[PDB]
Amino acid sequence: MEVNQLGLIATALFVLVPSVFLIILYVQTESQQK
């Protein structure tokens, strides 16, 4: 099928950029003193 050839990278970064943001914030929360 003749899909938009930027759809893959658009989708990958749409997931990965905010997901990474959240994982960074989560892990550094856990590593804070209890």
Added chain:
Amino acid sequence: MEVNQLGLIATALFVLVPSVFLIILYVQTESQQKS
């Protein structure tokens, strides 16, 4: 130019996956308790 159409995502993921890994490790090191 007729480049390989997966080069873009290959390059972006090559940069981003390991860079993110290191950023995650650095930030959680900084957030740890000091002496």
Added chain:
Amino acid sequence: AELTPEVLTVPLNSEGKTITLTEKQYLEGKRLFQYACASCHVGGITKTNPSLDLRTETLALATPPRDNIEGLVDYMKNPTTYDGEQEIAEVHPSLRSADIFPKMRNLTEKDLVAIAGHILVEPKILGDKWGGGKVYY
């Protein structure tokens, strides 16, 4: 616009005579057509044979001619195919087949005239909607 005596003036016969129906006759004609005919002929079409409609021009080209009161009254007594060739009372409501189409049992001659007048008057009002089917709804 009004339902005038002119609108209600329709051909009686093939020889140029007309009859001017009263407003009560028009209303009766609508009621009676709904009662006995509209299950197949709603809006001037024919649901069980869409090739034949109740448009005035169609009725004019039927044999014998059905575009007048006498032709329509006769049709309701002894219906024929469009070419006049076969009598179809056994499969089309008629006074002749009132035994098998029981709604025809109570229709009087006056009532047939009213139904006939409705078939002729309605396209004068509705234009192409009459016999037009869904395209013109």
Added chain:
Amino acid sequence: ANLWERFCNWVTSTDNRLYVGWFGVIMIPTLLAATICFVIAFIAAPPVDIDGIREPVSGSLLYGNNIITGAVVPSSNAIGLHFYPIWEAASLDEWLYNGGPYQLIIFHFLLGASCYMGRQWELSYRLGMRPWICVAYSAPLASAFAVFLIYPIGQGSFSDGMPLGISGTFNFMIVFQAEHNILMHPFHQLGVAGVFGGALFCAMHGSLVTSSLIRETTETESANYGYKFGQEEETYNIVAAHGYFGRLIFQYASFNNSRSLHFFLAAWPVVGVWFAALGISTMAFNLNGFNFNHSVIDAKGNVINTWADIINRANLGMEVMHERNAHNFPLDLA
């Protein structure tokens, strides 16, 4: 204890991370079968002859669909209401052509979701709760029954069941509108009042409780930390919330009784959705929306259109184009 006793104790145990229960004994296998078949079919199923006219419709991702166009396609009109399990097909290839996955999925799902409802009763009983959460769940459940079972029954085919897909859903909606004028049916109208009103009251309740949260935190922390799980004291001031809302409208239009409020919050969407479901389930037997086509006529007898007649024109468009190769005779009678 003997084995059966032990087994019964485990099934009905209040200590399992996920409650099993007797309902769950039927729910778990049926939901897993429906899920596994759906996933595989949505990915990899070949085209399905939905309309029984040897015109196969592609629903799966591998056969040219995206998430929005994809579906598991209803079983063939040739089958109608006949039961078409795998073992009634000569082969899986035939089973697939004829839309066998649809039936397997919807039947396992409807059984499983019915048992999900029973399971909600069952756990409420084990925990000493009041029993009626399951009654609220009967609203979406009834709606799924309406579109996957009752409508097919009325029309005489599972081919007219809602497709298991996003665009398929819209197709079902547009054809339903053509055939039943659902928008003009008071039960779908009640359904709309039910979901628009459920959304309104959801936002309203959320906003009013959030408005009135008691100060327990500082500006550099989430107000959420001001509530601790299982604390005895209410966490907002209902008197303040009522003070607010009663002035927004007038006093006697606002609830000062939390129980009465929370009952209204349940009842409004549930009852409306029950009417939605009953709309679909009664249009299943072709008692349709209000028909005011040509209801307004002038002194001569000219038709004076209203907005109902304009709706009618749109509906006609849908009617004449839908399933464009399936009708041979002038009336669409089912």
Added chain:
Amino acid sequence: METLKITVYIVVTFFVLLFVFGFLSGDPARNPKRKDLE
């Protein structure tokens, strides 16, 4: 197909028997308060 049919029949019967016998197994008493409901 015959073998599949029989297998599914046996599977369904197995689970249905568990549901029925299970609810017959003193279900009213499986609650946290009053058990003597018989």
Added chain:
Amino acid sequence: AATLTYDDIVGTGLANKCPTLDDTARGAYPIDSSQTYRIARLCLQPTTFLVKEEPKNKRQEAEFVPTKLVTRETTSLDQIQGELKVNSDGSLTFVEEDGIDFQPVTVQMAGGERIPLLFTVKNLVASTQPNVTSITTSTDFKGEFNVPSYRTANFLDPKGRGLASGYDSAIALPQAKEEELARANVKRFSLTKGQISLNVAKVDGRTGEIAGTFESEQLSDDDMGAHEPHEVKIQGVFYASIEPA
């Protein structure tokens, strides 16, 4: 014995089967050349559909390969009737007149390719050898028939395009160049010939009933000209009732 009703048959699959004759039916049905005859019922029950594989450039001998039927027990031709002429050399010619003389059939090749066809004997004209003074288990009929387009002229593709109806262009690509889409936009109605052999295996000389095997060859669906059809060979069993008319 039996004489089965619709309620005995319904849902069994027997409705898609041709009648059979028992093994004792090895007689001779005499033909009086002064008498006119009809086939009162011709029935064809296909048991195998074979599709000719399409080879790569090689010009190897392409084989007909087996396929899986996906449209269920909806394949037989039946209630066919027509004149059975006695010709001046003693040959018989069956001229098909009417009946349930086609079925759309879809069969599936290894790997998933679906092959629709209009399995048919429409306008069949089939003849025996000369000097057929009795129909016997040596008799055979060979003939030709017409294979019209699998879809008729009103059929609309998924984008609304058709021959006697529908759009005449790809309206979702309003400014595409029309030339590369011409084969999909301009619908064509196929009409080709097929060939059939009927080999009589059983004759009840008393009743005029004959049964045997057939093999037919014809083209499959071409999707109103959008693609090339496949060659299909159909094999099965037949029954005919011959009568003086």
Added chain:
Amino acid sequence: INRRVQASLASGATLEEAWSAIPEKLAFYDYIGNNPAKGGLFRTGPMNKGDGIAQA
């Protein structure tokens, strides 16, 4: 391939017949595009992607 061809000639085959008796499968192995030492580290994908899908 040469051995088969020679045996065919010696049995009285014409040249056309001798070479026509060689299986396409055998001939295709005697083509360097199927040699695994003709590739490249960054030349990705199936062999079909370079020389094409062999037809005949």
Added chain:
Amino acid sequence: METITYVFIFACIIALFFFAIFFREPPRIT
């Protein structure tokens, strides 16, 4: 690539459900 991307996202969602259920922060009473 499209199909892979859809299936990948779905499979991540399914894994998330697993972690959200079985590896949730446990709710604790005060």
Added chain:
Amino acid sequence: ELVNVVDEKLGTAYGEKIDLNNTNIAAFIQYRGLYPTLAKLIVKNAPYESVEDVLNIPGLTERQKQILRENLEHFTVTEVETALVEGGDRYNNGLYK
């Protein structure tokens, strides 16, 4: 070189008159006296080399012949088009109102 044969036929007399060899049977409703009796006969005995050959249908009454005579000016013949006569389309072409 690809042609829609129905569109092409509309540029012949088929587009101007009742084609005795092709036109669907409802078209005979246009003129007095032709439907359904003569219409059926005409379709059944088609095709015709010329319009006048319609007069040679066996069994026509004298009245039928005269009706046919009066309507020849509204008839034509063109070569039979497979697309218009297959499917029983001359008896029902999928058009109602």
Added chain:
Amino acid sequence: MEPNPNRQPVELNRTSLYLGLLLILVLALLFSSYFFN
């Protein structure tokens, strides 16, 4: 569950982050030409 005694914190200092990012970015800058081909 009593806690697992084998757990240890993990560290990446700033200099290591910078070294690591340099490695990754330079490798990308090197290999990207071959990825596009």
